[PDB]
Motif scaffolding. Structure first.
Motif, mmCIF file in Angstrom:
data_model
loop_
_atom_site.group_PDB
_atom_site.id
_atom_site.type_symbol
_atom_site.label_atom_id
_atom_site.label_comp_id
_atom_site.label_asym_id
_atom_site.label_seq_id
_atom_site.Cartn_x
_atom_site.Cartn_y
_atom_site.Cartn_z
ATOM 1 N N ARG A 133 0.897 -1.175 0.045
ATOM 2 C CA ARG A 133 0.005 0.123 -0.044
ATOM 3 C C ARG A 133 0.920 1.166 -0.036
ATOM 4 O O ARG A 133 2.160 1.295 0.151
ATOM 5 N N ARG A 134 0.135 2.434 0.045
ATOM 6 C CA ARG A 134 1.022 3.438 -0.460
ATOM 7 C C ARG A 134 0.652 4.728 0.414
ATOM 8 O O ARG A 134 -0.452 5.370 0.410
ATOM 9 N N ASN A 135 1.731 5.486 1.079
ATOM 10 C CA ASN A 135 1.689 6.656 1.885
ATOM 11 C C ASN A 135 1.829 7.729 1.068
ATOM 12 O O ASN A 135 2.707 7.663 0.097
ATOM 13 N N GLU A 136 1.070 8.970 1.399
ATOM 14 C CA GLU A 136 1.360 10.397 0.783
ATOM 15 C C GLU A 136 1.631 11.003 1.723
ATOM 16 O O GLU A 136 0.950 11.062 3.072
ATOM 17 N N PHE A 137 2.644 11.866 1.847
ATOM 18 C CA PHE A 137 3.049 13.003 2.709
ATOM 19 C C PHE A 137 2.813 14.399 2.157
ATOM 20 O O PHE A 137 3.263 14.161 0.877
ATOM 21 N N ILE A 138 2.372 15.117 2.765
ATOM 22 C CA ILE A 138 2.389 16.659 2.142
ATOM 23 C C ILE A 138 2.892 17.559 2.972
ATOM 24 O O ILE A 138 2.517 17.545 4.142
ATOM 25 N N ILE A 139 4.229 18.024 2.792
ATOM 26 C CA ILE A 139 4.727 19.040 3.652
ATOM 27 C C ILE A 139 5.098 20.407 3.023
ATOM 28 O O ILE A 139 5.261 20.509 1.809
ATOM 29 N N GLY A 140 4.722 21.345 3.819
ATOM 30 C CA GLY A 140 4.562 22.795 3.452
ATOM 31 C C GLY A 140 5.941 23.574 3.946
ATOM 32 O O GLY A 140 6.252 23.307 5.538
ATOM 33 N N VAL A 141 6.733 23.989 3.589
ATOM 34 C CA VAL A 141 7.911 24.533 3.620
ATOM 35 C C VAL A 141 7.704 26.171 3.149
ATOM 36 O O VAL A 141 6.938 26.464 2.174
ATOM 37 N N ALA A 142 8.523 27.210 3.828
ATOM 38 C CA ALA A 142 8.398 28.526 3.575
ATOM 39 C C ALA A 142 8.781 28.787 2.181
ATOM 40 O O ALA A 142 9.528 28.092 1.537
ATOM 41 N N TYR A 143 8.303 29.805 1.441
ATOM 42 C CA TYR A 143 8.603 30.206 -0.056
ATOM 43 C C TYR A 143 9.654 30.520 -0.222
ATOM 44 O O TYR A 143 10.189 30.458 -1.565
ATOM 45 N N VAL A 164 8.691 12.632 -5.308
ATOM 46 C CA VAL A 164 9.001 13.637 -4.108
ATOM 47 C C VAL A 164 9.071 14.901 -5.267
ATOM 48 O O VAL A 164 9.901 15.192 -5.993
ATOM 49 N N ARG A 165 8.019 15.787 -5.036
ATOM 50 C CA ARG A 165 7.644 16.797 -6.013
ATOM 51 C C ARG A 165 7.093 17.969 -5.689
ATOM 52 O O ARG A 165 6.550 17.772 -4.457
ATOM 53 N N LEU A 166 7.586 19.070 -5.932
ATOM 54 C CA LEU A 166 6.706 20.415 -5.654
ATOM 55 C C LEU A 166 5.447 20.516 -6.134
ATOM 56 O O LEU A 166 5.074 20.153 -7.683
ATOM 57 N N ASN A 167 4.242 20.458 -5.431
ATOM 58 C CA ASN A 167 3.096 20.061 -5.857
ATOM 59 C C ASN A 167 1.990 21.156 -5.890
ATOM 60 O O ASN A 167 1.239 21.260 -6.638
ATOM 61 N N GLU A 168 2.188 22.108 -4.948
ATOM 62 C CA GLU A 168 1.299 23.289 -4.685
ATOM 63 C C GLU A 168 1.886 24.608 -4.270
ATOM 64 O O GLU A 168 2.776 24.425 -3.446
ATOM 65 N N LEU A 169 1.667 25.622 -4.999
ATOM 66 C CA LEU A 169 1.926 27.148 -4.385
ATOM 67 C C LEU A 169 0.800 27.468 -3.505
ATOM 68 O O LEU A 169 -0.106 28.181 -3.992
ATOM 69 N N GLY A 170 1.003 27.240 -2.330
ATOM 70 C CA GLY A 170 -0.247 27.569 -1.201
ATOM 71 C C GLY A 170 -0.148 28.958 -0.870
ATOM 72 O O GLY A 170 0.761 29.571 -1.148
ATOM 73 N N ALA A 171 -1.107 29.229 0.140
ATOM 74 C CA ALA A 171 -1.272 30.765 0.514
ATOM 75 C C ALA A 171 -0.080 31.229 1.393
ATOM 76 O O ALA A 171 0.384 32.211 1.129
ATOM 77 N N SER A 172 0.373 30.355 2.188
ATOM 78 C CA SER A 172 1.644 30.532 3.010
ATOM 79 C C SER A 172 2.582 29.727 2.796
ATOM 80 O O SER A 172 3.780 30.018 3.537
ATOM 81 N N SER A 173 2.726 28.650 1.934
ATOM 82 C CA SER A 173 3.645 27.831 1.758
ATOM 83 C C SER A 173 3.883 27.154 0.621
ATOM 84 O O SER A 173 2.672 26.985 -0.083
ATOM 85 N N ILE A 174 5.021 26.554 0.266
ATOM 86 C CA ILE A 174 5.283 25.717 -0.934
ATOM 87 C C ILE A 174 4.895 24.404 -0.524
ATOM 88 O O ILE A 174 5.444 23.850 0.888
ATOM 89 N N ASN A 175 4.135 23.615 -1.195
ATOM 90 C CA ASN A 175 3.847 22.149 -0.532
ATOM 91 C C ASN A 175 4.438 20.826 -1.468
ATOM 92 O O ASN A 175 4.179 20.923 -2.397
ATOM 93 N N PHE A 176 5.022 20.279 -0.942
ATOM 94 C CA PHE A 176 5.894 19.037 -1.684
ATOM 95 C C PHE A 176 4.914 17.690 -1.273
ATOM 96 O O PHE A 176 4.571 17.721 -0.163
ATOM 97 N N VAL A 177 4.790 17.080 -2.204
ATOM 98 C CA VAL A 177 4.185 15.792 -2.190
ATOM 99 C C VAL A 177 5.244 14.554 -2.309
ATOM 100 O O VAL A 177 6.156 14.594 -2.924
#
Ligand code: D10
Ligand code: D10
Ligand code: D10
Ligand code: OCT
Ligand code: OCT
Ligand code: HEX
Ligand code: HEX
Ligand code: HEX
Ligand code: HEX
Ligand code: HEX
Ligand code: HEX
Ligand code: HEX
Ligand code: HEX
Ligand code: HEX
Ligand code: HEX
Lengths: 254, 256, 262, 263, 255, 255, 264
Positions: free
Chosen positions: B160-170, B199-212
């Motif tokens: 089975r497969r884990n997904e992590f979403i990590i948000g780091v500063a811009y 391991v990729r840059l996934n989203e440009l969020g409101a307060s963070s860059i989100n990596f999946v």
């Protein structure tokens, strides 16, 4: 006395009827399978041909031992109806199964969404369909449920379309932003150039200007084109000094 | 007078019929069970064979005491229909029970989700299925309801497969972030290396860059791989000076 | 027709016979339908099932009786079936819901997914079962409301039983500031749950960093206790977590925000 | 056919007989169906059940009468059944909902899950029951609205009864600042509920730290009172909590936020 | 040959039957209307009495031209069933219409809420009910739908109850707030004094203390009592220096 | 042999029956249309009269070739039932179509809301109704669906009611605010003066006092009266120095 | 062996029974094709003509089986009962499809939409590819293929975006509370006046619409041809941005009045 003769005759009829049922119902089954009629349809219909004959046989057999002709119909009717109710859902799933096989709105191996449930089809059984979600869950959906609802197929078209929505600060040059974005999607070879390549100012948001970008790629490429293009947008805008704004607020002191 | 003779004959027929019903309906029951037909299916069908004969018996028996042949059908019909309505739900659950046993979309001991209700299957009774939730609640779901809906099985696939979403500063280095994350999942031996390792840059969020981050492990490992990998991400990013940003806001002051 | 009285009293005999048949039929119905009822009850068949089935045996006989009785006054045999059919169907529709609740009642009694006194959730409604009547089940909510749920509705849906298992599991989610020592936090939490004797030590005792939240790091703690203990174990453990973290200088963060002046 | 009048008045006799039968049948129906009705009412069978069943006994007889009456004017026996069948079925469909409400009405009266005057919640609709009519139930909401709910709808759903139990339970959730003394907070709260004589002391008296909230510590307090007292016990206890905490310098925190400045 | 005689007899029977149907079915209709049975019920039932006779007539008439007795039942049965399906919804609305008229859960002119739709009833037609919303929209709801659901009637009770919820700053005097509010509702004569007059501290909110005030007035007065009382609460609290707080927040700096 | 005679007779009967069906079923159709019975109702019913006769004809015709009388009923029954199921939805839409035409809860050209879908009715076809949304979309709704649900009609009443809700700062003069608003709606001639003209303090909001204003105009005027009145409220309040407050917050600093 | 007079006696009814089945099956084929051509030639739908012909066929097979089984002693009510049950069994299995079949006919027949039109069928939008016997296929704006059963389609609403040649954009623009209402309107009006893809003989609304929490909101409504609608919106919006920036009209950020205190 000679009741014994009716009783043996009744058994003889049951036996002869059961045997003549087997053969007539196999004969008709081979006939339809050989004429390229679906295996399940040919099966279902042959089963009816079978029991139709057993029914006629029981009527005649029970008839010879004095059990009246309407009584046999009533009783068998009830029995049939009892079985009918119990088999009702399955009968409906059976049919849906045939139609999914027959018209193949999806095929094993395609990523589909069946009533808000998405994953890759493994197989279509007699009564239900099995799929594996993107993260390794096995979902089993009844065929009837599937065919009653929408079937979204992600895999059927070879070419599909990414949309990006990028928010930049209100003081960005609309022309520059567009130019940069256009350069990014021009230089990406996995983006089909003979199709739509939209790059427009789309929305005046609360804290940002929002640009939409829409660009087609092959199904296989779609995932990575999005990721790759997005990372470039980030690096490029940072290089060009285009700001991705945080939430904005004007505060008036007192 | 000789009404007495019909009345005793009527009883004789009922008795002889009830006995000849028992045996014919057991004969057919053993025949099915011995031919490896389901115990409940063989039971249900034998019960019909039984009452079919009692029905024929009552018709002939009541017949010999002058009760007309259509009257018996009508009356028994009504009775049958009354019982029919009362037994309707159960009959449907009965059938679902057979199919769950027969096709085993799940098996006792598997963690499943049956219509937004998840837990480990204990048993599949004649009419309903019992499961224990992760926190010790016992849920009892009717079989019919189960088979009408989706059956999500968590236990069937071994991997089975884990997904992590990590948000780091811009202002994080996209390359560094990826490198660190990749090192973490490379060094985790419970992460299958012959499968996806995104391991990729996934989203440009409101307060963070989100990596999946997406990485496969065996079912058994999945829980702890997530926890262990997450704690490392925290420690590593802190060591490397990669910031987990708080909510952000640009505020523009004025005076009234 | 004063003189034509041979064919007059001639009808009187059918009319009295018709009544005689009704009377004899009603009496022979009572006994046959009680005989069958005792027979089932004595064979350990449910009281309500034996009742329901006996009631059918009764009216089957009244039906046969009315057919023969009305028959002897010239009312045709198909007419009686049609009329009684309609009547039966009228009653059928009126009794439909109850008949369904009746059956559910039998099955809840018969299989006891829950028992009086157990805390259960029946279709998003939770409380302690008082009784299972013929048609419906009564429960008392945690705060003294009496809820009455139809049996049919109960058996069609899920039955969550809180009381059936002797051992159950608390989950705590604690949020601490981003600068907390992950090791210290875990150690303290582990000491708390180690020293609680109502927490079963031969079962799961999870204490992990679970989530990187917007303003806090979130630790999950999962620990089994007996049903009876579950409530107070949660409260007691939670108060300790508070006092311990305060002592150790572990911060429970308020909502966070970085503000950039312009 | 002026002279052919032997077979003419010959029909007249069936036509009058047909009417005679209808009349005699209608009269013998009235009495048999009242006799049965009084018999049931006197045997303490519900008035509506006895009514419904008597109405069937009535029309059963009118049906038999019409069959025999129309029969004597040559209208065939299966035709009358078919026609009446259709008519019955037409009426059946029209009367279907009401028949179902009628039955629910009986069961609500018969089992009294609620009684006139009790505050109840019937499918997310709450108020005090006024009456249970033949087909529907009327209630008055707390603010004077009259709601009319069909009986069938009521009995298909849950019936929450607020009035049936004599004793009920208030829950208070109080939020105090993160720097409050857990012991002090509990002590004060406990004193408040100890000194309230409308709070049953032989029952639960919970006062615990319940939640670590975003901006506050939340204490739960749970205490039983009689139904009648429940409303005012809540109000009175709440006002004391306010005054007491203010006196003891326990803070009810506003929304909290740590803000980190930059330029 | 003499088929012609059956063919004319068949027509004669149809004609005689149609005429004897008209009269028997009007006779029954006047009988019911005169016995104070509902006009629609008497209509519906009379229509059945009519066609029952046409059915018997067709059976006998088609019978005398050799069309068998079971065939006529089957065919008419089908026809009846076809019409039955088409008329099904309307038949159900028809019945609901009767019951709304008969039991009058609402009456023309009353403000009601029928399944989350509120307005003033204009009329109850055979199949549906018409109402006018407070802002001049005409809504048409099928009778069957109405009677299947709840019927909330705002107009039936003569006396109704306002609730006010007022939020004041956490530092307000609980006694003063109550006193002022009580003075306001005491001096309002449209507030029934023999009924509930609740004024209590109700909630400890995030930024305010919330007081509930509950007071009964006649239906007609309810609207204006609310508005008038609310304006006084504003002016009075302002005069007494009781603060209506804005959203509150404690902010803890650093950098 | 003389089977040939039954076989030709069977055909003769079918032919004679089909012809006698056409005419009897047109005769009835003209009779209804001329008696001002709906064209679709008269059509539907005539179609039944037709097939009833074909049914009787087939029974007699197949009968003379030895096909038994119950067999024909059973078979035609099944066929009828098969067609019945297929035609079921349409039959229901057909009936709804009749009722919408017959009772005209809406008329072509009226703005209506049919089950949360609004626009201007174009036409009511046999099975469905077509409307154009305010922005040029064509929606096609089945008639049955329409008649089962509510029908909100915006166009039926000639006079309709705007509601404005205006928020002003907590320190506004309640009297001034009301006066200004009242002057605005007094001077607007498209506002009916013989009807409601409400201007009241309605709500004590989190950051503002909210005044409600309710005023009737003709349907045609409603849109522009709202826009025009709103712009005046803006300009007037700005002139009079009445503040439209932004979101408010009291912030309490610490270190 | 010797009792063979009554033996071959049955053989005749058994062969006759087969003869009847064969003759009946053949006479069914032709009668049911004859009717089928007759309908198709009278411009009756191909599927309707098919469905109805299939009934004409089996009606005859039914009559044939009754007579054929009849001559081997199987009673006439038994055949009806049995075939009835069979029919009903098939009936239940074919029920959904029969309903989809009918919907298919009606969609073809009344064409609420046509292949190539952008439509919304029960909250699902895209361009119709085809209407099969039982279901309709469409392609979403982003290349997904959706397959919706015909019956489901006709039971619900059908929104058609493509049918009308002219359609209407709405813009909602928020400007700061201190903007000149007249200026804002004038600028917006100039923008939509100078856009030639905006139909000038139709509505051209530009009004103050809402007093929002942080902004004044102006609505602008203007008709264009379906084809133009997309780009008119984009082009007009970009101008609004550039024009307002030039004229110094502010697009406000979220607003808040904050009132300071010093707790102790
Ligand atoms: C009628 C059964 C024989 C197989 C038909 C295949 C149809 C394919 C449709 C795409
Ligand atoms: C039919 C008469 C039986 C009455 C039943 C009474 C039940 C009382 C329960 C409160
Ligand atoms: C309020 C009940 C009125 C009933 C009248 C019945 C007439 C038929
Ligand atoms: C006829 C009584 C059977 C009871 C079943 C018991 C299952 C727990
Ligand atoms: C039976 C075919 C009729 C088709 C009508 C077409 C209406 C647009
Ligand atoms: C009810 C079970 C049927 C299964 C046929 C394979
Ligand atoms: C094929 C088996 C029929 C009965 C299922 C309960
Ligand atoms: C097994 C009992 C028979 C069912 C009647 C409710
Ligand atoms: C009424 C339910 C019968 C129980 C059969 C096991
Ligand atoms: C016990 C009463 C029978 C139910 C008739 C409504
Ligand atoms: C009261 C008789 C029934 C009428 C149905 C409309
Ligand atoms: C449809 C009308 C029924 C009335 C019974 C009181
Ligand atoms: C009363 C008219 C008959 C209904 C056909 C649509
Ligand atoms: C469908 C037609 C019914 C109209 C009755 C007035
Ligand atoms: C007019 C066509 C009849 C219905 C078959 C789909």
């Amino acid at each position: 006395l000679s009741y014994a003769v009716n009783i043996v005759a009744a058994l003889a009829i049951i036996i002869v009827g059961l045997i003549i049922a087997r053969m007539i119902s196999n004969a008709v089954n081979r006939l339809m399978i050989s004429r390229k009629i679906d295996a399940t349809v040919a099966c279902f219909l042959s089963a009816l041909v079978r029991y139709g004959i057993i029914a006629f046989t029981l009527i005649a057999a029970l008839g010879r031992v004095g059990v009246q002709t309407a009584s046999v119909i009533a009783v068998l009717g009830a029995a049939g109806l009892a079985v009918g109710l119990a088999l009702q859902g399955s009968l409906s799933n059976l049919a849906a199964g045939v139609l999914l096989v027959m018209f193949r709105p999806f095929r094993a191996g395609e990523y589909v969404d069946l009533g808000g449930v998405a994953g890759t089809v493994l197989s279509v059984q007699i009564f239900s369909t099995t799929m594996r979600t993107a993260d390794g869950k096995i979902i089993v959906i009844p065929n009837g449920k599937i065919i009653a609802g929408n079937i979204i197929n992600f895999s059927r078209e070879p070419v599909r379309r990414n949309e990006f929505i990028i928010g930049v600060a209100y003081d960005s040059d609309i022309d520059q932003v567009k130019q940069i974005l256009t350069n990014i999607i021009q230089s990406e070879d996995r983006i089909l150039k003979d199709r739509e390549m939209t790059v427009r100012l789309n929305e005046l948001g609360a804290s940002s200007i929002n640009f939409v970008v829409r660009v087609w790629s092959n199904s296989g490429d779609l995932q990575n084109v999005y990721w790759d293009v997005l990372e470039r947008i980030k690096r490029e805008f940072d290089a060009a000094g285009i700001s991705f704004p945080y939430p904005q607020m004007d505060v008036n002191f007192k």
